[PDB]
Amino acid sequence: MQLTPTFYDNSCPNVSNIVRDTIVNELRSDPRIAASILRLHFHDCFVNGCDASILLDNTTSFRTEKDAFGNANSARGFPVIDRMKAAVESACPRTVSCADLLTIAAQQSVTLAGGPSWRVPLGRRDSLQAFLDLANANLPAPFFTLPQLKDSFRNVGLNRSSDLVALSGGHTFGKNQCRFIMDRLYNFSNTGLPDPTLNTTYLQTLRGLCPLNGNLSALVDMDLRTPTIFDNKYYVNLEEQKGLIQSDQELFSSPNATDTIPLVRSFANSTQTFFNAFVEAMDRMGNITPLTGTQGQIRLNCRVVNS
Amino acid sequence: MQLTPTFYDNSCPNVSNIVRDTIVNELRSDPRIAASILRLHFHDCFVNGCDASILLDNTTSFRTEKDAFGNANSARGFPVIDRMKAAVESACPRTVSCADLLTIAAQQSVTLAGGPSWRVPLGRRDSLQAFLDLANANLPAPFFTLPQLKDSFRNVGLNRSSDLVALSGGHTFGKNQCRFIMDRLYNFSNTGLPDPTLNTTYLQTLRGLCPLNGNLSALVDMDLRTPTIFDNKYYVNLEEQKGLIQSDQELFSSPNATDTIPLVRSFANSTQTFFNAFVEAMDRMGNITPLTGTQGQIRLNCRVVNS
Ligand code: HEM
Ligand code: HEM
Ligand SMILES: O=C(NO)c1ccccc1
Ligand SMILES: O=C(NO)c1ccccc1
Ligand SMILES: [Ca+2]
Ligand SMILES: [Ca+2]
Ligand SMILES: [Ca+2]
Numbered sequence: 001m002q003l004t005p006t007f008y009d010n011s012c013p014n015v016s017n018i019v020r021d022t023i024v025n026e027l028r029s030d031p032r033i034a035a036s037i038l039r040l041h042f043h044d045c046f047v048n049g050c051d052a053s054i055l056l057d058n059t060t061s062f063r064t065e066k067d068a069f070g071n072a073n074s075a076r077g078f079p080v081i082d083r084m085k086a087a088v089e090s091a092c093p094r095t096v097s098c099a100d101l102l103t104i105a106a107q108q109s110v111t112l113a114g115g116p117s118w119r120v121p122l123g124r125r126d127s128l129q130a131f132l133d134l135a136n137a138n139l140p141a142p143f144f145t146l147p148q149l150k151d152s153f154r155n156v157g158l159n160r161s162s163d164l165v166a167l168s169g170g171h172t173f174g175k176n177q178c179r180f181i182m183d184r185l186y187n188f189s190n191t192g193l194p195d196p197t198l199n200t201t202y203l204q205t206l207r208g209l210c211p212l213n214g215n216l217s218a219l220v221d222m223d224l225r226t227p228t229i230f231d232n233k234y235y236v237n238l239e240e241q242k243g244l245i246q247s248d249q250e251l252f253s254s255p256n257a258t259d260t261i262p263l264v265r266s267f268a269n270s271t272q273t274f275f276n277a278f279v280e281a282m283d284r285m286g287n288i289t290p291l292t293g294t295q296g297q298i299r300l301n302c303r304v305v306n307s
Numbered sequence: 308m309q310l311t312p313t314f315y316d317n318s319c320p321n322v323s324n325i326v327r328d329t330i331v332n333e334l335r336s337d338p339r340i341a342a343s344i345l346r347l348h349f350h351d352c353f354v355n356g357c358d359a360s361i362l363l364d365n366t367t368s369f370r371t372e373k374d375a376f377g378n379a380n381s382a383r384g385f386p387v388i389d390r391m392k393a394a395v396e397s398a399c400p401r402t403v404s405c406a407d408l409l410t411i412a413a414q415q416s417v418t419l420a421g422g423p424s425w426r427v428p429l430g431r432r433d434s435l436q437a438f439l440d441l442a443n444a445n446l447p448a449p450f451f452t453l454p455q456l457k458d459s460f461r462n463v464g465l466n467r468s469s470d471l472v473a474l475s476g477g478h479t480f481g482k483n484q485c486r487f488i489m490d491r492l493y494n495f496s497n498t499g500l501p502d503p504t505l506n507t508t509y510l511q512t513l514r515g516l517c518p519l520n521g522n523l524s525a526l527v528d529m530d531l532r533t534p535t536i537f538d539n540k541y542y543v544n545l546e547e548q549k550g551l552i553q554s555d556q557e558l559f560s561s562p563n564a565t566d567t568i569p570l571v572r573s574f575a576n577s578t579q580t581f582f583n584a585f586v587e588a589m590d591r592m593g594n595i596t597p598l599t600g601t602q603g604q605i606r607l608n609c610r611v612v613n614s
């Protein structure tokens with residue numbers, strides 16, 4: 001079955017508003033939640049498709065993806081997801097899947113942060129288990145080279161350069177722990193020297209935030225220009241060699257960036273072009289091997305499989 | 308209202324078995340769960356009493372105690388608690404509180420680990436909010452001195468030396484992160500030397516497990532003799548200066564341990580005496596300012612307050 005943005009127009013016409021309202025309230029106490037939610041959706045889709053497998057808690061039959069390298073002590077916002085599911089179950093019992101809920105939540109998060117507004121295709125159903133080992137192999141790491149980042153995306157069906165460049169624009173807001181950039185700051189590639197593609201003045205600022213013997217869990221803004229606004233500033237930073245993580249800067253400075261540089265230049269100089277591309281890439285990501293029809297179920301509680 | 312072990316004998320006579328069955332199944336995949344659960348009960352009781360406040364997830368009206376120093380990236384087993392609550396709600400809808408469930412789970416965990424078996428007083432109800440700031444002040448820290456550990460316990464009503472010594476016997480099983488003993492190993496009290504009350508041969512073993520530049524999250528066994536069995540070996544270790552954390556060894560080596568040494572000697576040489584004392588101390592802890600009668604509620608989902 002093909003996903004359609006009209007899937008709940010009859011069964012639960014107000015699911016979008018309920019989702020938006022929940023995030024709006026949460027943003028008041030946690031300005032970072034919008035970024036956290038968009039990330040949860042991405043990590044859901046890259047492991048067996050957008051099937052809400054990442055939302056399952058540990059059981060005796062399978063381990064949670066929340067323990068995966070990249071998720072463990074990093075991914076957050078789960079209780080917030082619980083809140084909107086409860087509110088939706090009240091208005092539309094056993095109607096909206098967690099997989100779709102997380103998808104709408106990601107879109108609303110982007111819009112609420114100043115990004116584009118669009119209707120996401122719906123109709124996905126929830127998985128009956130979690131895939132930890134798969135998550136440990138499918139999620140891209142910040143130390144990956146450009147070709148490696150390309151392989152990671154192609155591995156799940158996003159084989160276009162625009163997919164990688166556009167979706168990476170998700171780093172236009174949100175935070176990153178010092179631990180993931182320590183090497184770029186003090187000893188890159190076993191050279192004992194910092195990453196040469198990192199702007200020197202910016203290097204001083206980062207070293208101040210992430211000292212050699214400091215807290216590795218200390219958080220830094222992904223986008224130094226507009227830390228909480230979803231815009232195209234992420235690309236301007238790359239042109240100035242101010243991409244925070246290795247995977248960010250490689251989009252512009254890697255020797256294999258022949259095909260990505262033009263997209264960065266384009267996105268850095270046109271919000272419309274970037275927004276159009278981001279929406280297209282997002283819908284493509286949301287279409288990775290979804291469970292539909294009678295496959296999977298409509299979870300009542302996103303943390304556990306239905307009895 | 309006074310707590311009574313017969314509280315559910317009519318309303319939900321099989322709650323004990325349902326709780327035991329859940330832990331037995333979990334132990335198969337996670338041998339540490341018994342220790343984790345007993346600890347969750349202790350951290351519940353020390354903050355506003357055993358009211359299941361520690362089980363509440365973050366909300367926009369109050370912050371979760373799961374973020375407290377001592378709980379954050381340390382406390383675990385929450386999904387397991389979710390599992391037994393679901394099973395109990397199926398057999399006895401809206402009957403057993405999370406506060407009581409966590410209490411029975413703690414007792415069964417001790418028994419299943421080889422400890423004593425007894426009927427816990429019941430009748431507690433669930434809180435309507437969590438107390439993070441209170442948790443940050445009420446939970447004892449591993450770097451506390453003997454008098455400080457005594458003040459911490461007296462602060463919640465456990466003003467007897469036996470309470471401190473007996474309950475500390477909970478370290479007869481379970482794990483501890485390297486981060487909490489690094490100072491005893493390499494630089495105790497700003498002296499640049501290890502803790503003199505730590506056995507030197509054991510110090511070598513620990514330094515091997517917790518290297519100066521190693522993983523601070525690496526886990527070490529609390530009891531080097533019988534790491535997973537609930538017995539009195541914890542006290543024998545203290546006599547040999549092999550207590551893992553500072554608060555452990557101080558029970559035997561502190562200059563203020565005049566009143567605790569005799570209890571340690573006694574408990575180290577008689578399982579019966581220790582078990583009797585542990586059960587008495589546990590029931591006293593389980594009686595810290597409970598919510599009863601019409602106070603609080605019977606939570607349907609331990610993570611959230613009833614609508
Ligand atoms: C190209 C490969 C990617 C890599 C290697 C990567 C790596 C990372 C790293 C290291 C962090 C910080 C984690 C932490 O400090 O706990 C992070 C955060 C984030 N990423 Fe990515 N990421 C990638 C792609 C994406 C994509 C495609 C999106 C979504 C469109 C995304 C959205 C986010 C957001 C919004 C945050 C901040 C989350 C928060 O603050 O809670 N990332 N990413
Ligand atoms: C006297 C003050 C106490 C201090 C300062 C203290 C401190 C600690 C520390 C540092 C850990 C390791 C945490 C980690 O590595 O994440 C721990 C674990 C543990 N504690 Fe205590 N504790 C105390 C009292 C108690 C009491 C009274 C009980 C319950 C009767 C208890 C039961 C446990 C258990 C079973 C574990 C292991 C948990 C697991 O492996 O998941 N503790 N404690
Ligand atoms: O966000 C990640 N992958 O998308 C990630 C984060 C840190 C370590 C490994 C992977
Ligand atoms: O277990 C604790 N308190 O009981 C604890 C653990 C580490 C740091 C602070 C407190
Ligand atoms: Ca998934
Ligand atoms: Ca931005
Ligand atoms: Ca409590």
Ligand SMILES: [Ca+2]
Pocket residue numbers: 479480530532533534535536537538539540541
């Ligand atoms: Ca033992």
